[PDB]
């Protein structure tokens, strides 16, 4: 139940001036910029991702993230891919992206970067140790299965 990763989820949205500098028109649609605060966006995001989605319904999710939260479809798709499809890490992605002013957030558990994927395929003991310290064994095994199945 408890996890020390909760620090990445509990970032105070009121400390993030809206819209954040990193949130550009190449990533977000006009609807996004009509939210009144970071908290309002995050609360709508929570409502979307709390919906009923079967494992095969990434397209419906991406459409709802476009229509309700103003996230562009190609960006939602890229995020979903780097989260290994774990919808529970979507809020974490935006809070850390916005707080850090960096996309993707480079040092967040559950958010796989290009460097992380290269470490995974490297066969290097040290790189794998750092990688599992970041994401954990369970996520590392899921990521390997994604690569094995030609999903990445």
């Amino acid at each position: 139940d408890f996890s020390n990763e909760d620090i990445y989820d509990n970032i105070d949205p009121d400390t993030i001036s809206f819209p954040p500098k990193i949130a550009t028109t190449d990533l977000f649609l006009p609807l996004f910029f009509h939210f009144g605060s970071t908290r309002q966006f995050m609360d709508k995001l929570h409502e979307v991702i709390s919906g009923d989605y079967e494992p095969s319904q990434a397209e419906k999710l991406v459409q709802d993230l476009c229509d309700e939260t103003g996230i562009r479809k190609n960006f939602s798709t890229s995020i979903l891919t780097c989260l290994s499809g774990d919808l529970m890490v979507f809020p974490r992605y935006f809070l850390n992206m916005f707080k850090d002013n960096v996309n993707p957030p480079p040092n967040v558990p559950g958010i796989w970067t290009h460097d992380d994927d290269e470490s995974l395929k490297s066969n290097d003991q040290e790189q794998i140790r750092k990688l599992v310290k970041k994401h954990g064994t369970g996520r590392m095994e899921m990521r390997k299965r994604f690569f094995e199945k030609d999903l990445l």
Binding site: P55, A58, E59, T77, L80, G85, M88, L151
Partner: peptide, 7 residues
């Protein structure tokens, strides 16, 4: 999208 999703 082929990425399967979950909670």
């Amino acid at each position: 999208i082929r990425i399967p999703i979950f909670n």
